[PDB]
Amino acid sequence: KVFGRCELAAAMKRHGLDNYRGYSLGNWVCAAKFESNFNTQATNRNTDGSTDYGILQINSRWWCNDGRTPGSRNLCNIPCSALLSSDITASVNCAKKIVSDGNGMNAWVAWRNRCKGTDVQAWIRGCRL
Ligand code: NA
C-alpha cells in the first residue's frame, strides 16, 4: 500500500505516535516520506547483508527475523514480512521500541539528514487531524 500523506498522518496519530517520546507527528511523516516514499512494501539491502523493511525501513540486523540475516537479533519479535503489510500496526509498535532505545529518531538516517532541524510540521499541514 502506498499511503497518502494525511492518510498516514491520521493512522500514525490513531496508533499513538503523536508526541511519542517527544516527537511531534510531523517528524514521523517526514521520516516515512524519505525512508520509503510512504510505500509499505519498500525494501532495501544494507552493506552488512541485513535488510530494511516497510514504511519506516526497520532493519533485520536488530529488530525482525527475515531468515537471511545470521547472527542478528529479533527485538520486535516479528517476521520482517509483517512490516510490509497494509496494516501499519506492527511497524508502529516496533518503531516505538526503536525510538525508546536511547538514540531517539536519530536511529533513522533519513530523519537525521532530511527532517531534523527543518519545519517538520509542514508535513501535516492541511490534514484534518
Ligand atoms: Na534479525
Task: Name the features.
monomer, 129 residues, mainly alpha, Lysozyme, three-stranded antiparallel sheet, binds sodium ion, signal, EC 3.2.1.17, disulfide bond, Glyco_hydro_22_lys
Per the CATH scheme, the topology name is Lysozyme
The biggest sheet, with number of strands, parallel, antiparallel or mixed sense and barrel status, is: 3 strands, antiparallel
Oligomer: monomer
The total beta strand count reads 3
Helix content range: 25-40%
- Give the structural class: mainly alpha
What does the model show?
By secondary structure, this protein is mostly helical. It has a single domain, classed as Orthogonal Bundle (Lysozyme), CATH 1.10.530.10. Helices cover 30% and strands 6% of the residues. It has 4 helices and 3 strands, in the order ααβββαα. It has a 3-stranded antiparallel sheet with strand order 1-2-3. Helix 1 crosses helix 2. The longest helix has 12 residues, at 25-36. The protein starts with a helix and ends in a 15-residue tail after the last helix. The structure holds sodium ion. Residues 60, 64-65, 69, 72-74 line the site of sodium ion. Sodium ion binds next to loops.
Summarize this structure briefly:
The protein is mainly alpha-helical and about 130 residues long. The protein has 4 helices and 3 strands, in the order ααβββαα.
Topology:
Blueprint: H1 5-14, H2 25-36, E1 43-45, E2 51-53, E3 58-59, H3 89-99, H4 109-114
Antiparallel strand pairs: 1-2, 2-3
Helix pairs in contact: 1-2
The chain binds sodium ion.
PDB class: hydrolase
Keywords: Chicken egg white, N-acetylmuramide glycanhydrolase, lysozyme-like fold, hydrolase
Assembly: monomeric
